[PDB]
Design a binder for this molecule. Sequence first.
Ligand SMILES: O=c1cc(Br)[nH]c(C2=NCCN2)c1O
Ligand SMILES: [Mn+2]
Ligand SMILES: [Mn+2]
Length: 180
Amino acid sequence: SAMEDFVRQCFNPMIVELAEKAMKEYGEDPKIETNKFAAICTHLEVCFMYSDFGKHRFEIIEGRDRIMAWTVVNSICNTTGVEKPKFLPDLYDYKENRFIEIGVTRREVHIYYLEKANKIKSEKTHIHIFSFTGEEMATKADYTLDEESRARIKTRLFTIRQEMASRSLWDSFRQSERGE
Ligand SMILES: O=c1cc(Br)[nH]c(C2=NCCN2)c1O
Ligand SMILES: [Mn+2]
Ligand SMILES: [Mn+2]
């Protein structure tokens, strides 16, 4: 139906294949859990943009299989002494020397920030939350990126939102917490 079609028009093949593998892992069907499909693609693409806006400053951990992701986190810990996270984060920042958790929410950015902060309960992992309304929230209000990069992410999220809205998919998507 329409959600899968939108996902295939708007995200590039590699992001789609990754998100489908992420679904198959749990046991989820992208033709059924279409909002989650879309949410997974959107989070993947934001993580990749964030990382590409970096000598590379960021290490992408999101998108790898679990073995490789924990291998990367483990390597970074052993070579920096940075404390190991309890949950797989999304990126490592070699400039600030900290892991980053990236949130993408359809609700208020502060609501989701509190949710993430309460979940990961690690004072060391930096948290950065983007909404589809051009809003952000980050630990200590440290946004890591320069204005143009954060703006490119904001524009892309809002675009995804407006594309769902013109297809009439947005209301189902923002009323669903699935994918956050
Ligand atoms: O932002 C996120 C929201 C949700 Br739900 N899951 C994850 C995740 N990272 C590694 C495995 N699962 C996020 O990074
Ligand atoms: Mn992640
Ligand atoms: Mn994340």
